[PDB]
Amino acid sequence: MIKNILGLALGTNSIGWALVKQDFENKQGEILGMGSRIIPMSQDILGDFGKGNSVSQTAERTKYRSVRRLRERFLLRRERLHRVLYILNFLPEHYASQIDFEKRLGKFKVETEPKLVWKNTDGQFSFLFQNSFNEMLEDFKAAGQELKIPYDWTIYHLRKKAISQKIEKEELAWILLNFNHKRGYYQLRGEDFEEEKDKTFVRLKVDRIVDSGENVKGKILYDVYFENGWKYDKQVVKTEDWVDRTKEFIVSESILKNGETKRTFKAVDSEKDWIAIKTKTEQEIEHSHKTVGTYIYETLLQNPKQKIKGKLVRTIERKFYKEELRQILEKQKEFHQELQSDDLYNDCIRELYRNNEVHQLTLRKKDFVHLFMEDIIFYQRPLRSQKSSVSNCTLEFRKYKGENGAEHTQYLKAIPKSNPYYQEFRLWQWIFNLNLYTKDNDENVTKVFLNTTQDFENLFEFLNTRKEVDQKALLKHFKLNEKTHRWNFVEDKKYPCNETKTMISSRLDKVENISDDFLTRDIEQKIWHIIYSVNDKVEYEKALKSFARKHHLDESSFFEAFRKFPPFKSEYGSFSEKAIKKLLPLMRLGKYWNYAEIDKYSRERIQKIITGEYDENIKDKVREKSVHLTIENDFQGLQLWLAQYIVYGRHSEASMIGKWNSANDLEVFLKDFKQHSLRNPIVEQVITETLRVVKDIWLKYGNGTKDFFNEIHIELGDTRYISKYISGILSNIVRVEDGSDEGVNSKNIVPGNGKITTQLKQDWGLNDVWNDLILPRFERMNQLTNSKDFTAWNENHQKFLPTVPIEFSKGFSKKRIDHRHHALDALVIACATTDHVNLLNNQSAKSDTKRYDLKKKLMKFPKQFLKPWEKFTVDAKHNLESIIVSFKQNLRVINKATNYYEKYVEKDGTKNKERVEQAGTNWAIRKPMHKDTVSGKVDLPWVKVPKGKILTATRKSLDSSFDLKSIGSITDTGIQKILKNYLAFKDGNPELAFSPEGIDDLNKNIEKYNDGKPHQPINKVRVFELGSKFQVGQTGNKKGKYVEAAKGTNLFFAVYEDEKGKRSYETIPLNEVIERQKQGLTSVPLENEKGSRLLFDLSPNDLVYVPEIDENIDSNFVFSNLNKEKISRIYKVEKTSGTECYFVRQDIAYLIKQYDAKTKIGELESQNKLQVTMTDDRIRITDTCVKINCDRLGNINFITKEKIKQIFNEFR
Amino acid sequence: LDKIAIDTNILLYAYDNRDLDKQDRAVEILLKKPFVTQLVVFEFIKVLERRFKMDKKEITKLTIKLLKEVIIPLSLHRDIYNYSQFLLQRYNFGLSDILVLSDSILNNCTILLSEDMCNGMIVDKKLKIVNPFL
Ligand SMILES: [Mg+2]
């Protein structure tokens, strides 16, 4: 009779709502309201989520956290090294003097930057290792290149020297710290592959390409021949890049069973591929048969100018560093008695593990070599347990009373899919589900060859001995043939067949020297537990050895067979082991079918169902399905559903329907919603904001009255999966409980489609309404363009319609340049009755009489569809011109954070490791504080610096992008002159001048451009800039780092006005906001130093109103009479810099034409937004604007008498 | 090297002469040109009018002379109320005392020469309360 309709259009980041109260029978209706909620994503995310490349904030947060964690681990390693070296007394006196060892153990003292190889006295820095430096001078002299070297090259020479000679304790400290500082690549899992692992990187030149006669697609392919006698396995087509060329590949040789190597080939590129560089350095170290440090040395010996880090040896295996460091420690351990002492080794162990008795006792049995290698420097933590995220069993529950005086339920974790119980359960399911078919008459030959229990028992026993059943094996088991029969499933697919038991049997037969009775169910379960539980290589070896020792078996080949056991695949079942253990006795048949192993509950239920009595848990469905279970023996060869109902008492998953009696249920569900519970964050945030807006609309227009909504319609417009979820969520409101509306989704939810939307928009005049509404931007565009092409006249409607020139029609779309199309689509979906969508989806009728009634009732004769009521167009246009858009804001600067760290707490006279919350208050900054690139402060006499600005410079690589002015923007004047000379010699052509070959030519002939004076080669130059960059920090060298404000952190823009009326504007940096909010103050200062009271602050996506020039708004208030002009004079803050604030008309979503540098024409000039009003008046908005705040539903909120009453009625 | 502020009791002991030694201490403190917050001035005026029953004109003359010569008044800060709310979370003093502390701290004062304020502990790691009569 009277219907309430809620149409929702959910975009990628926008939500359009429309609530309407209508009467269809009388063609009478009025619109209750509509609105648009915009979640602000930039165009980058919109263009990226179609494909997806780290499209999440949590992803970058995790990246930063991981980087910080690695840094902290390195610092902890250094701290432990300092403590150990101090307690052993190996460090130099001055170095040990500047490190705390009482409160902040192992950390440098405040405002200290000590160095191991440099001593400070009366402002002079002196080297510490003079004799070693002289020794390296003598080497070079033997090499005979130069006598000039930095004092800090000695580290590599001494690293080589410790291999066969004694050096000082400070030498050992320096080498150990250097090794800590550079660990190397490593893989924790291990699981050693094929015995070869060749992967050898070689560079081979093709000799000839004999034609192989492979004519494919009109082209004959050749082969590849190398000097060594190798051939590329893949074919070659183009001969231009393969004849007599040196081609390099990483090649792996695998010994096949036939007895010959199966060499693999893969293209690699020098100094461009990480694996290629790694392997090249690996081989270069390997064929030298020397330590990596020694290799670096020798390279330094050959060429002193060779850079080491990042270029010569970047990535190699950690085992090389391990080998070198062991060698040096075992060499030095002889000379230094301290490395063989025991009092110092107990003292250092106690220092490291004072509160750990166990680790102290364990490590008291090792030597210093183990501490330096395997406990401090090269220790790598194992992976954190991932079992916490495993899903819960849906059948087994536990009830317990907690400390909170209640009784709640803990779930059971899912059984691993590798569990032999689960494997057996799945195999039983497949064996019971098998039904056979023939090929001649295609009859169901099953139940003939599989009728008695003996056949099923034989099939099970046959399938135990295999790992994977298929067509051939299944057919041969019955002596059948491929040409005559099938098994109702894919003829070329294989299914799991409990491979764990077969693999265990194969290994236990390979070990031999035992009887064929060691393997049983208990042994299989214990083997599964041993392999799956111990996920660590050495501990797996120990567990296997212990298992072989306890049982009376020879540990000779069993260990070899079981050491290469493949780690089990990461997968878990739906249920747990408890459910499978309960259910399995029921399914089995024959000797495996037993009534004793069944528990009390299932046995009693079976007795009740065979007795035929009445239980409160038995329905007529049960007696319908289980009428064939007359005797207790008939429970043979059961299936999952019947056995599940027998065990637990519920038939499958019927859900709980669900009904929400008011917004209390919806807000409870929103509060209890779990984050990261969807595929991607965008969808979950869209759904959450949809729930928020529907909650707000129900609260407002229902006034706490249940069942206010009657129908809800959903339109979507990659995003397809959200439809079913949102329908399931929203079903819980207008579901009908009488039984006429049952199922997964309510019949009330009527999804829409683009077809009905566009049809109704064109037929009902809404397209014309949209076009006339969006015209004003178009004639403004015509005026600024000085052309009439943007509006084209038409005589069929006799008016001007929007149009675009073809060059600007690439991604042009009329409907997408205003935030109100969402509300318009919500309105059209709302009034779209289910008859409309049913008719447009079922146009094929097969009879005119069936649908002619709908043709008459919905369509005005097949020409145009009827309007819902007389005043549809007028009301729609008025409401669209009288709506304001509400934007979600993100202003999180700081937030409270909780830190839980492990510590040995003293309780009940004993020490126990446990979690402790960090004391005090620790805020967490919720925005990036600055940009990544760091600039240093420099001064230049030849540049005039205005006050309030500083000169800052940073390094940049040299490339062709350097022009004359760029050279003029370099800190080093001599470099400027040399570059000018070279560019002059290059005729002022930056492209050809600054090519890498040209850069090398400059470097080698640098005398020709520095007037014959020597100068070092040029690769990077420090370019300067006069600006205002703040400091990163205030302690240590953090004062020497200057950075720029990060993107999207100019959140607050303050507008003050002095006593006489003048308005002043400032921008508050994020640092000031952080400090003010930490102190408990407000974000923006209440009073600028100028002596002006603060009118208001502005944030991105804020709303302001600009009064007309003639009118004066001082205490107007009255923000309910919002007509066309007042709403059209509402602007939104977009960005801010200094005293400049940029606004955009609130209804503008996408500019008609963006700004370009060539033609220099744009809808909103170069900044794509104006500091002033867009209209002809061109008045600076900030001088007269007034801030406006709105709720989610786009309703303006202003003070009232009741609000003033309540604001301190609440404190009473 | 560090700013100094005073509490109303310092002025009261400077004026009242019932205990001469504390009066001498207060006078000595006032000799160093200490800063003062307007709330202290208003409390002093209220006490003089109420406790000591001096008439309005002489009280105003005394206040004007003191502000012109002896002590430096501190401009009232706009963030006094928010900071006073923040200070109440950790410290349990009187509300007027909290306001005095907030206005002193917001003006970069590092010492608050007071007596009835449990001298000794730092306040927000920015200001400390010192009893000069001990
Ligand atoms: Mg007081």
Side-chain angles (χ1 to χ4, degrees):
Chain A
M1 171 45 238
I2 291 299
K3 284 73 61 183
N4 308 343
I5 301 299
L6 197 48
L8 283 72
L10 311 188
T12 80
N13 70 325
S14 50
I15 294 163
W17 67 265
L19 181 67
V20 64
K21 182 163 72 64
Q22 202 195 351
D23 173 24
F24 182 79
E25 79 197 41
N26 299 295
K27 304 332 171 213
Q28 294 214 16
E30 64 157 306
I31 297 169
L32 284 178
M34 73 305 298
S36 296
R37 181 81 158 167
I38 302 295
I39 309 310
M41 321 285 98
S42 73
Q43 192 160 355
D44 169 73
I45 296 89
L46 321 173
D48 211 328
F49 77 95
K51 40 193 155 68
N53 179 23
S54 164
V55 292
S56 179
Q57 299 287 314
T58 312
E60 62 155 350
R61 189 202 182 215
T62 295
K63 193 102 177 72
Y64 297 132
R65 173 162 72 254
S66 83
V67 170
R68 292 200 306 264
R69 210 162 267 152
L70 274 175
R71 170 82 174 157
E72 293 298 331
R73 259 72 171 266
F74 159 78
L75 279 182
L76 192 55
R77 278 198 304 274
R78 190 184 84 204
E79 285 163 307
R80 287 167 98 77
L81 262 183
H82 288 171
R83 284 155 86 188
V84 165
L85 287 165
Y86 182 49
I87 196 167
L88 277 296
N89 263 344
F90 282 25
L91 310 173
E93 202 280 329
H94 76 87
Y95 195 90
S97 291
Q98 288 164 265
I99 308 163
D100 178 14
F101 294 101
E102 286 73 17
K103 273 79 73 177
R104 275 173 40 260
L105 318 182
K107 291 199 216 259
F108 295 138
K109 285 162 193 211
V110 176
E111 182 65 26
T112 58
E113 199 181 308
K115 274 158 283 293
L116 195 145
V117 300
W118 294 105
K119 180 201 176 310
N120 184 14
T121 184
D122 53 73
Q124 295 300 321
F125 275 113
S126 288
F127 199 63
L128 200 66
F129 293 7
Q130 291 84 16
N131 200 9
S132 307
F133 182 76
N134 295 121
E135 291 167 329
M136 187 66 204
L137 290 171
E138 302 139 18
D139 154 277
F140 286 113
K141 168 253 201 171
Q145 273 54 70
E146 272 181 350
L147 270 296
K148 60 181 185 178
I149 47 171
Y151 280 96
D152 295 7
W153 273 359
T154 65
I155 179 65
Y156 303 148
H157 157 79
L158 299 163
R159 262 172 67 156
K160 182 190 161 84
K161 183 178 183 293
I163 282 294
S164 60
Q165 278 168 73
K166 178 202 181 76
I167 47 176
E168 318 287 353
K169 45 214 187 183
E170 299 85 353
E171 276 270 88
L172 270 297
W174 191 19
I175 296 162
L176 282 155
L177 292 157
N178 186 234
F179 265 118
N180 174 18
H181 212 287
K182 187 71 179 294
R183 297 228 301 180
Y185 180 85
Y186 172 80
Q187 272 297 336
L188 181 71
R189 186 166 298 283
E191 289 292 334
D192 173 75
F193 293 115
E194 293 179 353
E195 186 61 32
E196 184 65 29
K197 315 185 55 154
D198 196 71
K199 293 282 285 300
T200 302
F201 166 77
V202 289
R203 316 177 84 259
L204 320 176
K205 188 185 282 294
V206 182
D207 306 334
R208 285 192 304 278
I209 47 169
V210 187
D211 211 7
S212 311
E214 187 64 34
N215 199 1
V216 178
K217 208 166 68 59
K219 183 64 201 84
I220 301 93
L221 315 183
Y222 311 82
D223 69 350
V224 183
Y225 267 111
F226 299 114
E227 54 93 21
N228 47 24
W230 301 353
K231 179 177 280 186
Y232 188 35
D233 60 335
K234 299 287 97 176
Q235 297 279 283
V236 60
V237 191
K238 266 73 73 174
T239 79
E240 60 86 19
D241 63 335
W242 272 87
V243 290
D244 59 33
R245 286 295 186 277
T246 310
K247 286 218 162 196
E248 47 198 1
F249 315 90
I250 277 177
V251 295
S252 306
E253 289 185 45
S254 76
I255 297 290
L256 209 60
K257 270 78 74 172
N258 52 9
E260 280 191 310
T261 71
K262 184 60 177 178
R263 180 177 287 104
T264 73
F265 283 87
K266 181 181 179 295
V268 295
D269 195 4
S270 310
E271 73 255 8
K272 188 181 284 293
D273 291 13
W274 174 90
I275 176 61
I277 300 151
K278 189 174 165 285
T279 313
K280 183 177 179 181
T281 307
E282 289 289 328
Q283 295 170 194
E284 281 187 355
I285 298 151
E286 279 287 325
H287 54 55
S288 63
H289 309 110
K290 286 142 66 90
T291 58
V292 55
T294 311
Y295 181 94
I296 294 159
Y297 181 60
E298 186 273 344
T299 55
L300 186 62
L301 293 173
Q302 181 254 339
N303 172 30
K305 297 284 281 182
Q306 190 74 45
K307 177 178 174 63
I308 305 309
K309 69 175 179 66
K311 195 192 43 176
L312 175 64
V313 59
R314 55 171 74 252
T315 175
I316 55 173
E317 281 299 327
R318 207 200 291 283
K319 67 179 189 293
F320 281 74
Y321 298 105
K322 289 171 84 72
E323 184 68 29
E324 190 179 3
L325 174 78
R326 73 175 67 254
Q327 285 191 259
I328 61 169
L329 278 70
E330 281 97 8
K331 174 56 58 162
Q332 193 58 252
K333 184 165 189 109
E334 318 159 24
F335 312 111
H336 279 291
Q337 307 293 107
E338 308 82 61
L339 290 182
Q340 297 161 276
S341 174
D342 288 330
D343 285 340
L344 297 175
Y345 184 84
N346 298 317
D347 286 1
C348 77
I349 285 171
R350 281 199 320 282
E351 166 63 27
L352 263 61
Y353 307 94
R354 156 62 49 193
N355 292 14
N356 192 320
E357 305 295 329
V358 171
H359 201 92
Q360 272 194 42
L361 264 71
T362 298
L363 271 288
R364 276 180 196 273
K365 279 74 180 170
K366 326 300 190 302
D367 62 326
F368 278 96
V369 178
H370 180 269
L371 293 174
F372 283 131
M373 301 265 268
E374 292 301 323
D375 197 72
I376 300 304
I377 297 169
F378 290 110
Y379 165 63
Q380 177 166 347
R381 288 145 203 82
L383 304 168
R384 280 231 186 105
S385 169
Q386 313 278 325
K387 305 289 182 69
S388 182
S389 44
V390 178
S391 295
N392 317 285
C393 182
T394 46
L395 309 174
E396 289 295 337
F397 314 131
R398 266 157 190 152
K399 38 203 175 295
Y400 64 92
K401 295 180 174 181
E403 313 93 23
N404 44 5
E407 181 177 5
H408 63 280
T409 289
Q410 173 144 45
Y411 290 106
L412 277 80
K413 290 305 189 181
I415 182 179
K417 290 194 190 163
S418 55
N419 193 307
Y421 283 104
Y422 180 82
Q423 296 294 321
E424 197 196 0
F425 174 45
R426 177 182 58 192
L427 195 55
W428 279 119
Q429 287 177 264
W430 181 92
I431 289 163
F432 293 150
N433 287 349
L434 171 72
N435 59 332
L436 299 148
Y437 277 132
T438 191
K439 266 192 174 292
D440 293 339
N441 289 117
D442 307 331
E443 81 197 359
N444 206 22
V445 73
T446 198
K447 190 58 66 70
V448 181
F449 300 154
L450 287 159
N451 204 339
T452 184
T453 52
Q454 183 61 77
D455 289 339
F456 275 109
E457 285 170 78
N458 281 119
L459 179 57
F460 179 63
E461 285 183 354
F462 161 70
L463 293 186
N464 296 115
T465 65
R466 305 176 68 92
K467 66 167 72 175
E468 202 172 10
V469 74
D470 46 2
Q471 180 74 260
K472 175 64 72 175
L474 189 59
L475 287 181
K476 191 180 287 186
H477 165 263
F478 294 94
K479 203 67 75 174
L480 265 55
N481 221 23
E482 165 63 28
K483 313 288 177 64
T484 178
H485 280 84
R486 53 201 269 280
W487 62 292
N488 202 193
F489 290 108
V490 179
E491 297 165 353
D492 63 308
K493 189 176 168 51
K494 303 182 171 68
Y495 275 72
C497 203
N498 204 340
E499 60 258 22
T500 299
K501 162 168 212 193
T502 302
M503 187 179 288
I504 287 173
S505 175
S506 308
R507 272 168 168 73
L508 281 173
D509 183 277
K510 268 213 291 190
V511 54
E512 305 195 359
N513 66 65
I514 57 165
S515 299
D516 56 345
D517 199 73
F518 169 73
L519 174 52
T520 184
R521 200 80 181 74
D522 191 7
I523 293 292
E524 188 189 347
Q525 201 81 13
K526 275 170 158 312
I527 287 164
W528 161 87
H529 180 256
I530 284 282
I531 305 170
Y532 156 82
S533 60
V534 181
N535 46 1
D536 193 71
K537 282 290 289 185
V538 54
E539 299 291 325
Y540 183 45
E541 299 160 351
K542 301 316 172 64
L544 292 167
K545 280 196 208 299
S546 164
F547 187 94
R549 280 193 292 102
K550 268 203 173 184
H551 297 91
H552 294 338
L553 282 72
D554 198 0
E555 67 275 16
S556 48
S557 65
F558 168 80
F559 186 78
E560 287 292 334
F562 263 73
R563 67 165 314 269
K564 296 293 288 194
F565 207 107
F568 300 124
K569 187 179 185 296
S570 173
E571 39 186 36
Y572 300 86
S574 289
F575 306 147
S576 57
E577 199 184 305
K578 193 175 178 182
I580 293 172
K581 278 203 271 190
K582 282 193 189 302
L583 284 150
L584 260 178
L586 277 296
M587 275 72 91
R588 306 167 164 150
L589 60 83
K591 66 182 180 283
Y592 304 94
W593 177 88
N594 192 8
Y595 211 66
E597 275 78 1
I598 306 163
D599 55 348
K600 298 173 73 66
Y601 281 59
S602 302
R603 274 191 292 111
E604 281 180 29
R605 288 192 90 127
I606 286 167
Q607 294 274 16
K608 288 178 170 67
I609 195 69
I610 66 179
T611 312
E613 65 97 25
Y614 174 63
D615 196 332
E616 202 171 1
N617 294 327
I618 299 174
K619 316 160 194 174
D620 282 342
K621 181 188 175 184
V622 193
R623 304 185 200 282
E624 172 185 342
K625 298 287 97 176
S626 60
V627 70
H628 63 286
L629 300 165
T630 66
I631 203 167
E632 59 94 22
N633 195 278
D634 281 332
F635 288 77
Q636 270 187 95
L638 311 183
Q639 296 189 358
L640 186 143
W641 49 276
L642 198 45
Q644 185 181 306
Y645 180 78
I646 287 156
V647 168
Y648 291 100
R650 271 90 64 82
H651 273 106
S652 70
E653 182 261 334
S655 175
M656 228 4 260
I657 308 107
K659 163 62 80 172
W660 296 0
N661 280 317
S662 68
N664 287 109
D665 308 333
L666 159 66
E667 61 86 20
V668 160
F669 154 80
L670 261 183
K671 184 177 302 316
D672 307 9
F673 199 47
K674 300 289 94 175
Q675 207 180 358
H676 294 131
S677 297
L678 274 297
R679 193 205 273 178
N680 64 6
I682 300 164
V683 164
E684 74 180 3
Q685 89 164 334
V686 167
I687 302 301
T688 301
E689 206 60 40
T690 316
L691 294 174
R692 296 283 169 75
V693 298
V694 307
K695 161 218 73 172
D696 209 301
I697 190 167
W698 185 96
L699 181 83
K700 191 172 175 66
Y701 293 9
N703 296 115
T705 54
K706 64 182 181 293
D707 292 330
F708 167 69
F709 299 134
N710 280 6
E711 305 272 320
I712 297 89
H713 313 288
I714 301 299
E715 170 65 21
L716 263 57
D718 191 19
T719 186
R720 81 284 185 193
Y721 182 58
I722 78 170
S723 46
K724 38 179 62 169
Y725 194 12
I726 193 66
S727 64
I729 297 169
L730 289 180
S731 298
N732 296 295
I733 308 150
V734 298
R735 185 61 64 89
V736 184
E737 293 179 353
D738 65 350
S740 70
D741 207 342
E742 307 284 356
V744 289
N745 304 7
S746 167
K747 73 184 183 292
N748 290 117
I749 314 188
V750 176
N753 57 64
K755 281 82 70 177
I756 178 67
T757 59
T758 182
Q759 196 62 255
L760 292 186
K761 287 153 138 194
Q762 214 185 71
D763 291 334
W764 290 7
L766 277 296
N767 221 337
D768 291 331
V769 168
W770 182 261
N771 283 267
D772 64 55
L773 205 72
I774 62 170
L775 278 179
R777 261 175 85 191
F778 291 120
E779 69 275 15
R780 183 179 162 282
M781 187 66 204
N782 272 312
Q783 188 274 331
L784 62 83
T785 317
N786 290 318
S787 76
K788 318 314 158 205
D789 47 23
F790 284 110
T791 47
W793 179 275
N794 75 150
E795 80 298 335
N796 60 5
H797 266 297
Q798 184 178 2
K799 58 182 72 175
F800 262 104
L801 271 292
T803 316
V804 63
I806 188 56
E807 75 278 5
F808 301 144
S809 178
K810 170 64 177 66
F812 182 76
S813 304
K814 305 190 327 177
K815 286 294 310 306
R816 314 310 155 199
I817 62 170
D818 199 314
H819 281 301
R820 293 168 290 206
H821 63 267
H822 300 109
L824 184 51
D825 305 339
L827 183 63
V828 69
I829 288 294
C831 293
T833 65
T834 187
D835 273 18
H836 285 102
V837 291
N838 289 346
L839 185 73
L840 272 188
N841 284 300
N842 298 321
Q843 191 58 42
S844 61
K846 301 170 184 175
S847 82
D848 291 333
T849 67
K850 253 199 177 187
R851 299 212 161 277
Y852 202 78
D853 54 356
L854 290 178
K855 300 289 94 175
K856 280 266 180 183
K857 189 159 74 178
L858 318 171
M859 151 75 88
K860 183 184 175 182
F861 283 83
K863 201 181 293 186
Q864 293 192 62
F865 292 123
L866 276 80
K867 312 165 41 74
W869 60 87
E870 179 65 28
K871 212 164 292 302
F872 203 60
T873 313
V874 176
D875 288 20
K877 181 182 177 69
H878 284 51
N879 281 262
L880 265 67
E881 57 84 20
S882 64
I883 188 56
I884 192 66
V885 184
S886 80
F887 297 94
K888 189 183 180 69
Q889 291 181 357
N890 171 252
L891 297 178
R892 285 197 198 93
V893 180
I894 61 157
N895 214 355
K896 87 161 290 182
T898 61
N899 178 31
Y900 284 106
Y901 66 104
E902 315 285 34
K903 191 173 143 172
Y904 264 111
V905 176
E906 167 69 9
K907 65 177 179 65
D908 298 329
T910 60
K911 303 286 192 234
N912 196 4
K913 185 184 286 186
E914 52 193 61
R915 324 191 61 61
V916 189
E917 172 150 345
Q918 165 158 6
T921 176
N922 205 42
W923 296 103
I925 320 299
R926 303 297 293 247
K927 300 260 177 269
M929 314 202 62
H930 49 71
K931 284 205 172 91
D932 291 331
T933 309
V934 179
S935 301
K937 160 176 252 189
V938 299
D939 69 28
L940 314 171
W942 53 279
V943 181
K944 181 261 294 178
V945 65
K947 65 178 73 66
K949 293 193 188 298
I950 59 167
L951 282 168
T952 53
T954 175
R955 268 162 84 86
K956 293 278 206 294
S957 278
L958 179 54
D959 52 12
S960 56
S961 74
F962 267 95
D963 73 305
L964 277 296
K965 181 172 71 176
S966 56
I967 293 173
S969 77
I970 290 170
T971 56
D972 193 350
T973 52
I975 292 294
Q976 290 193 66
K977 168 183 166 171
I978 291 160
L979 269 292
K980 285 286 186 66
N981 296 115
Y982 182 76
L983 185 59
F985 176 82
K986 285 281 166 199
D987 318 304
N989 193 356
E991 294 90 318
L992 301 183
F994 302 147
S995 66
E997 49 277 12
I999 293 152
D1000 168 44
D1001 201 309
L1002 187 153
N1003 288 320
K1004 69 178 183 66
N1005 308 107
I1006 200 160
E1007 315 285 340
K1008 290 182 63 58
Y1009 304 91
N1010 200 17
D1011 296 352
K1013 290 206 200 67
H1015 195 280
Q1016 296 282 0
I1018 306 311
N1019 295 118
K1020 293 186 142 211
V1021 298
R1022 287 173 62 89
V1023 301
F1024 74 93
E1025 195 178 88
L1026 162 77
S1028 62
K1029 288 182 192 213
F1030 50 86
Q1031 297 175 270
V1032 169
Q1034 295 304 317
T1035 189
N1037 45 0
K1038 285 160 210 198
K1039 281 175 282 190
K1041 313 173 167 188
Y1042 289 77
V1043 290
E1044 193 63 282
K1047 197 189 190 213
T1049 51
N1050 270 357
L1051 294 159
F1052 296 99
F1053 170 74
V1055 180
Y1056 314 93
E1057 153 166 358
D1058 61 350
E1059 56 273 20
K1060 44 163 281 303
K1062 174 43 41 193
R1063 272 189 177 192
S1064 310
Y1065 323 106
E1066 311 166 340
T1067 293
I1068 312 304
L1070 188 81
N1071 292 318
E1072 176 151 26
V1073 173
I1074 285 161
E1075 294 293 328
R1076 287 183 62 82
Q1077 284 198 7
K1078 270 162 80 64
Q1079 299 286 57
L1081 314 169
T1082 190
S1083 304
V1084 160
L1086 276 297
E1087 182 65 26
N1088 63 345
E1089 61 296 340
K1090 284 322 311 303
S1092 308
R1093 169 188 56 128
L1094 165 79
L1095 272 294
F1096 44 76
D1097 70 331
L1098 294 168
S1099 294
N1101 313 311
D1102 268 356
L1103 295 184
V1104 304
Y1105 162 71
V1106 193
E1108 275 90 1
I1109 298 99
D1110 63 358
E1111 67 173 356
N1112 188 359
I1113 298 309
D1114 63 358
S1115 195
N1116 181 12
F1117 292 165
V1118 192
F1119 284 116
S1120 60
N1121 51 351
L1122 273 294
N1123 46 13
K1124 158 58 92 173
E1125 51 285 30
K1126 290 283 185 67
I1127 296 169
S1128 69
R1129 292 195 79 81
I1130 293 173
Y1131 291 77
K1132 179 176 72 69
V1133 187
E1134 275 286 351
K1135 80 192 193 177
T1136 296
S1137 183
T1139 75
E1140 298 184 358
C1141 191
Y1142 284 79
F1143 297 78
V1144 166
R1145 264 262 310 280
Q1146 63 84 30
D1147 67 289
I1148 287 167
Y1150 270 114
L1151 301 187
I1152 295 152
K1153 191 217 165 299
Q1154 290 195 355
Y1155 177 83
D1156 51 347
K1158 292 177 68 65
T1159 311
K1160 302 197 187 300
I1161 58 157
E1163 176 79 35
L1164 297 180
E1165 56 85 19
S1166 73
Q1167 299 300 101
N1168 291 323
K1169 47 192 75 69
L1170 277 296
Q1171 286 185 42
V1172 304
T1173 55
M1174 152 175 59
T1175 75
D1176 65 345
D1177 50 354
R1178 182 157 280 103
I1179 47 176
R1180 174 138 157 98
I1181 287 162
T1182 67
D1183 304 332
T1184 60
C1185 64
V1186 289
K1187 182 141 170 293
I1188 302 294
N1189 60 5
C1190 69
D1191 47 45
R1192 282 202 184 77
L1193 300 171
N1195 306 125
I1196 307 305
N1197 190 357
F1198 57 97
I1199 192 68
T1200 67
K1201 162 181 275 213
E1202 199 66 25
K1203 291 168 58 150
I1204 284 188
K1205 166 63 154 292
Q1206 192 54 253
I1207 193 167
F1208 63 89
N1209 202 345
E1210 69 157 30
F1211 293 90
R1212 202 169 327 98
Chain B
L1 73 165
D2 69 290
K3 209 179 271 200
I4 279 166
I6 64 160
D7 182 85
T8 303
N9 57 37
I10 300 306
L11 301 170
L12 284 187
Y13 273 141
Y15 169 89
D16 187 64
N17 47 26
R18 297 285 74 78
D19 189 358
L20 277 296
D21 205 350
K22 301 175 88 67
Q23 180 167 251
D24 307 332
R25 264 71 70 80
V27 169
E28 182 65 26
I29 296 148
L30 286 177
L31 193 66
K32 295 304 299 166
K33 192 82 87 168
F35 293 82
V36 76
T37 175
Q38 313 257 22
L39 278 74
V40 163
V41 176
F42 301 137
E43 181 176 0
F44 179 50
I45 276 167
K46 289 329 174 204
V47 168
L48 279 196
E49 162 159 14
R50 207 182 334 278
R51 284 211 52 253
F52 293 101
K53 300 173 288 297
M54 299 180 33
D55 193 2
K56 319 179 285 178
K57 288 181 168 64
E58 50 273 60
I59 278 169
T60 304
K61 286 177 76 178
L62 171 51
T63 300
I64 293 166
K65 286 201 301 212
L66 276 169
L67 265 73
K68 191 261 284 189
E69 301 176 310
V70 184
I71 62 189
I72 300 173
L74 279 178
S75 179
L76 214 54
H77 214 284
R78 272 304 290 116
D79 301 314
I80 179 170
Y81 315 102
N82 293 292
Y83 199 53
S84 314
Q85 175 158 253
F86 170 84
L87 285 183
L88 272 171
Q89 297 294 321
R90 309 168 36 72
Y91 308 107
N92 195 358
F93 300 146
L95 190 47
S96 69
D97 294 332
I98 283 286
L99 289 153
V100 169
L101 290 159
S102 63
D103 193 14
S104 314
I105 290 154
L106 286 172
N107 294 291
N108 312 78
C109 288
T110 68
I111 308 297
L112 184 78
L113 277 296
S114 180
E115 182 206 30
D116 52 12
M117 282 265 298
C118 53
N119 79 325
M121 82 295 297
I122 313 298
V123 167
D124 197 31
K125 317 189 319 298
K126 319 183 89 58
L127 186 150
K128 83 179 290 192
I129 298 156
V130 172
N131 192 347
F133 307 121
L134 301 193

